[PDB]
Design a protein around this ligand. Structure first.
Ligand SMILES: O=P(O)(O)OC[C@H]1O[C@H](O)[C@@H](O)[C@@H](O)[C@@H]1O
Ligand SMILES: O=P(O)(O)OC[C@H]1O[C@H](O)[C@@H](O)[C@@H](O)[C@@H]1O
Ligand SMILES: CC(=O)N[C@@H]1[C@@H](O)[C@H](O)[C@@H](CO)O[C@H]1O
Ligand SMILES: CC(=O)N[C@@H]1[C@@H](O)[C@H](O)[C@@H](CO)O[C@H]1O
Ligand SMILES: *[C@@H]1O[C@H](CO)[C@@H](O)[C@H](O)[C@H]1NC(C)=O
Lengths: 422, 408
C-alpha cells in the first residue's frame, strides 16, 4: 500500500474560511456512501449539508512526496475535472493532513508524516490519528505529546506498581535511555510494571475521539489470551481522557483515576486539549484575547544583527523574527542557519522564517522554525527554541540562545529572556 | 608537541635541478658539524660540496599546517604540512632567493589521531644520483600482506614501514594479530608478534632496499628483515617471498617496482614514455567524449573530466577533475581531485591515475581520487570505455576503468 499505515483510518481535514470538512482516506475504503465507494477525498459542505467527492482512489497518481486524486466530475471550466493533491513530507509522528487551499477545481493538502519518510526509522510499531476537530471546526491536536522515545509515568500513588504510557502510539522500548522502560513488551502503549514483572496492558487501535465537544479520549486495548492472573478473567484496557483547563496553568502529570480489573482510567489535564489557535500563533506574538497570555518577542530582533550559538562541530546563527542573518548565510533564506566548523562551505537551513510557530502550553513557551533543508531521511530540518522567563538576563534583559543539542535533524536551543515572562 | 612522530628521524629532500640535498630535522638534532647544533634545515650544495643551514630550530614559528625556520644569514625555510595517510616524506617545492619551500603530506598533520599509525618510520631513500626510491604506496593502513612460504601451518603477515592495523583488517586471520606488530605469525590459531618497526628504510644496493623489524624462538629474539629489489625488467607484481626462516629470524625478499626510482614509475601528466618508464602510455584521447564521464553511486554521482577535459555544468563553480554530487541535495558539491594535481603511475603491472588536492574532509585529508585503469582492447566507445565508481575509504574515491588506452 501507498503509505500503508495511513490507510487504516479515515482522516479529517477542514477549510474554515469556507466551512468545509474533508474526509480523507488514501485507500478510498472510507465507506461514506454519500460520497462514492472509492472516494479518497470526500468534501462535506456544511452550510448546504452535502457530500461532494473531490478525489477518487482508483484515479491516483503517486510520486515520492505527492498524491494526486482525479475524479470524473468536470469543473466549471471545460476540459478540467475535479481533483485533490496531497504533498507528503517526512515527519516524526503520523501527523495530520493540513488543508492548504482549494479552488473551484482543485483541493490542496499538505501532510507531514512518518509514513512519508525515506528512512523508515521514524516509524512507530503502531500509531493512530492523534487529533480531532470540534463542532466549530477547530483542531484539538495531541501530536506535540507523542514521544518518539521514552514515555510518561502516570501518578497512581501506588508503591508496588509503576505505569507508563505513550500518546497515540506504542512506547519505543528498544532504544530507550531509562532501563525501566526497556523491560516493556514491544508494541505496548500502556506498560504495567509490578514487582519487576512488566506487563503490556494496552496497544493503540482507534484514533483520538472528541467526546464532550471538548474532552478527548484515547483507548488502548489488550484483548485476547495471555491476560495476567491479577486481572481475573478481564482483558487489560487503558482509557486516557485529556481535558482542556478553563484557564492557563503549569503542566501536570497524567493522573490515574481508576484501576480495577486492569481497566485503567487516566485523566490528563493539558492545554494541548484546547483548540490549536488558543496555543499558537504564526508571528512572534500572542495576545490575551486569542491566547489568554500576551507575548511579544519582536524586541529580540533588535551585537550583530544575529545571535550566534556555538557548538562542538557547527555554528548556529539564529536571526529571529525578521531579524537579519549572518553574512555567511546571506545567500539563503533562513531563520536558523547551520555552518560546518570544519567547512565554512557546508551550510544548512534548520528553520525558515516563513515556517514559524509560537506556542505556549502548560507553562512552556516555544518558538518553532521549520521547513529546513532535507536530511537523507527526508525530514526537513527544524529548530525549537525553548523560552524561559528571566527578568534579569544579559543584553538589557534580552539574552541569547544556547544550542542544547540535536535529535535527528531537529535542533534544540534554550533562550532565557525577560520577554519570556508570562 | 608539533608533529612529535617526525622528530625521531632526519628526513631528506632534494632539489635535483640545482643538485642540492636537504637534511630536515623538525627537532634540530641532525648532527651535521657544517650546519651547526641548532640547524633544523641543512642544505648541502652538492656542486660546491658545502653545507649551509637555511632553517634554525630555535628561530621557529609554527601553526597546525605550517612550520617556519629563520636564520641570521642575510634566509629561512618553510614547510607546509597537509594531512596524509602515511608518514610520507617532505617534498621540495621551490626555493626563491632567500626562502626554501617544502610540502609534507603526513598522518602527523591530520586533525584526527585516527589516521596516525601506532608506529611508522621513513619509507624512502635517495640514491647517489639523488633519485628517490619511495615505498609509501605499499604502506597499508588497513590489514597486511601474506608472505609466500611452504609451512601449511603458519602464515606470515607483514606491513610496510609500520604496524599492521588489526582492528578493521580485511582478513580474519590478520585480525588475530597482536596490535603494534609489523610482522605477525599465525599458527594453530596463535598469532605472534615477530617484529616491530624501529629504524627507517635502508638503501643497501643500487637496486635494493631493506627494512628491519625487531622484537619456538628458543631464547632467540624474533626479527624480520625485508629486502625490496627493483627488477631489471617490468613484470606483473609478485607477492613477497620468504627466503629464510631460522629460529624466529625471518628474511623476506620482495621484487617490486616501487623499489625502483620514482620518476621511472610516475608522470605529472597523462602519458608515460618508453624512455622514461619503459612503457608507452597516453590517456589524453579519453579527454573527448558531455565531454565529461559520469559514475553513479548510491548516495552520490561522480563527474569526471580527465586530462584537460571539460567538467560537468553542475561543477562550474570549482576546478575539479573529479566532482561529487549528493543525490538528495543537488547543491552539496565536493571536489574530489583537481586537474593540476595529477599523477599517472605504472608499477607491478598496474596503471593508476591519481587526482588529488581536493577539498579537505573533517579529518584534514584533502579528497583525492584514484582510477585503477585496466587493459581491454574491445572496451566500449571504440575502446574509450567509461569509469565505474567502486568505493570510498575515508575520502579517497576509487574507480575502475577498462579501456584499450590502458594496454601496454
Ligand atoms: O542527511 P544525513 O546524511 O543523515 O546528515 C544529517 C546531518 O547533516 C549535516 O551534517 C547537519 O545538518 C547535521 O546536523 C545533520 O544531522
Ligand atoms: O568531513 P566529514 O564531516 O568527515 O564528511 C566526509 C564526507 O563528506 C561528504 O558527505 C562526502 O564527501 C562523503 O563522501 C565524505 O566521506
Ligand atoms: C621573529 C621570527 O621568528 N620571525 C622572523 C620574521 O619576523 C622576519 O621578518 C623574518 C625575516 O625574513 O624572519 C623570521
Ligand atoms: C604541487 C602540486 O602538484 N599541487 C598543485 C598545486 O601546486 C597548485 O597550486 C594547485 C592549483 O594551483 O593544484 C595542485
Ligand atoms: C513555509 O514557507 C513557504 C515558502 O514558500 C510557504 O509557502 C509555506 O506556507 C510555509 N509553511 C507553511 C505551510 O506554513
Amino acid at each position: 500500500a501507498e503509505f500503508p499505515e495511513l490507510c487504516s483510518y479515515t482522516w479529517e481535514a477542514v477549510d474554515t474560511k469556507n466551512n468545509m470538512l474533508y474526509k480523507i482516506n488514501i485507500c478510498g475504503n472510507m465507506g461514506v456512501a454519500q460520497c462514492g465507494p472509492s472516494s479518497a477525498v470526500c468534501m462535506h459542505d456544511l452550510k448546504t449539508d452535502s457530500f461532494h467527492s473531490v478525489g477518487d482512489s482508483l484515479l491516483k497518481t503517486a510520486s515520492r512526496s505527492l498524491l494526486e486524486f482525479n475524479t470524473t466530475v468536470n469543473c466549471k471550466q471545460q476540459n478540467h475535472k475535479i481533483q485533490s493533491s496531497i504533498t507528503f513530507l517526512c515527519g516524526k509522528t503520523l501527523g495530520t493532513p493540513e488543508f492548504v487551499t482549494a479552488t473551484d477545481c482543485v483541493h490542496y493538502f499538505e501532510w507531514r508524516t512518518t509514513a512519508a519518510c525515506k528512512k523508515n526509522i521514524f516509524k512507530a510499531n503502531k500509531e493512530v490519528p492523534c487529533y480531532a476537530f470540534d463542532r466549530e471546526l477547530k483542531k484539538h491536536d495531541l501530536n506535540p505529546l507523542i514521544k518518539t522515545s521514552g514515555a510518561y509515568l502516570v501518578d497512581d500513588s501506588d508503591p508496588d506498581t509503576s505505569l507508563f504510557i505513550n500518546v497515540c502510539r506504542d512506547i519505543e522500548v528498544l532504544r530507550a535511555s531509562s532501563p525501566q522502560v526497556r523491560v516493556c513488551p514491544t508494541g505496548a502503549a500502556a506498560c504495567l510494571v509490578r514487582g519487576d514483572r512488566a506487563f503490556d496492558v494496552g496497544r493503540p487501535q482507534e484514533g483520538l475521539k472528541l467526546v464532550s465537544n471538548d474532552r478527548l479520549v484515547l483507548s488502548y486495548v489488550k484483548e485476547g489470551a495471555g491476560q495476567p492472573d491479577f486481572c481475573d478473567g478481564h482483558s487489560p484496557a487503558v482509557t486516557i481522557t485529556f481535558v482542556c483547563p478553563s484557564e492557563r496553568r503549569e503542566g501536570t502529570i497524567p493522573k490515574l483515576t481508576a484501576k480495577s480489573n486492569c481497566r485503567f482510567e487516566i485523566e490528563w489535564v493539558t492545554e494541548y486539549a484546547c483548540h490549536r489557535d488558543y496555543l499558537e500563533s504564526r508571528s512572534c506574538s500572542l495576545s490575551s484575547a486569542q491566547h489568554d497570555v500576551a507575548v511579544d518577542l519582536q524586541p529580540l530582533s533588535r551585537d550583530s544583527l544575529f545571535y550566534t550559538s556555538e557548538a562542538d562541530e557547527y555554528t548556529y546563527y539564529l536571526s529571529i523574527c525578521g531579524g537579519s542573518q549572518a553574512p555567511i548565510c546571506n545567500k539563503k533564506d533562513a531563520a536558523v542557519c547551520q555552518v560546518k566548523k570544519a567547512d565554512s562551505t557546508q551550510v544548512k537551513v534548520a528553520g525558515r522564517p516563513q515556517n514559524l510557530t509560537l506556542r505556549y502550553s502548560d507553562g512552556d513557551l516555544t518558538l518553532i522554525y521549520f521547513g529546513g533543508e532535507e536530511c537523507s531521511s527526508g525530514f526537513q530540518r527544524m529548530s525549537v527554541i525553548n523560552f524561559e522567563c528571566n527578568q534579569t538576563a544579559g543584553n538589557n534583559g534580552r539574552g541569547a540562545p544556547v544550542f542544547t543539542g540535536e535529535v535527528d535533524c531537529t535542533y534544540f536551543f534554550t533562550w532565557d529572556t525577560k520577554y519570556a515572562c508570562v
